[PDB]
């Protein structure tokens with residue numbers, strides 16, 4: 111019932127309603143001859159929408175905006191990218207051209223620039239130290255510390271008890287560490303524990319790639335990271 115790769119062709123995007131006024135968006139990308147799924151979030155804020163992450167590329171992100179317009183019919187006025195990789199910021203120029211205000215932490219903006227990736231316009235203050243949280247419209251943004259990346263943010267929707275872990279949290283079917291080129295393996299379990307401490311009441315946990323679940327995804331990710339550490 112949650113959409114998988116086989117159900118989403120290259121260039122298409124699906125929306126999945128998680129709770130009232132909260133959806134994930136699901137897209138796919140092909141690389142190195144394999145196909146990968148990717149998630150972001152959409153949160154209603156009155157008569158407008160907040161977008162969390164792009165749909166991994168310009169073409170997908172254009173399709174995302176068109177699917178939002180068709181299915182939901184409310185304007186995306188702001189978008190937050192939760193770290194600097196292309197699955198999170200690829201498509202920011204499309205958002206910007208469409209009149210969406212784009213945001214990321216100054217840490218993410220800096221790393222995107224170094225990588226040659228698209229750079230969200232606005233800088234989110236107040237997220238520089240592990241454990242920091244700020245409200246942004248209908249969500250809380252939380253910097254748990256370095257994990258999948260040094261800049262990774264998580265997002266919580268308090269009205270719906272939805273925690274969007276982004277790429278710091280792995281789906282259950284993922285048993286090996288992916289590409290950890292930019293990760294802080296040493297800190298990742300501690301950063302996960304900060305998420306658990308701050309959001310123990312979360313009822314839905316959305317990873318950056320793959321199937322949602324509950325808070326078990328946190329300990330799952332810790333297990334995978336620690337096994338990789340000991341490789």
Ligand SMILES: O=C(O)/C(S)=C/c1c(Cl)ccc(Cl)c1Cl
Pocket residue numbers: 195196197258277288289290291292318319
């Ligand atoms: O495992 C993940 O969640 C991500 S974002 C992997 C990745 C990395 Cl490490 C660099 C670059 C790109 Cl494009 C991707 Cl997809």
Ligand SMILES: [Zn+2]
Pocket residue numbers: 193195258259277
């Ligand atoms: Zn990443």
Ligand SMILES: [Zn+2]
Pocket residue numbers: 195197277318319
């Ligand atoms: Zn990712």
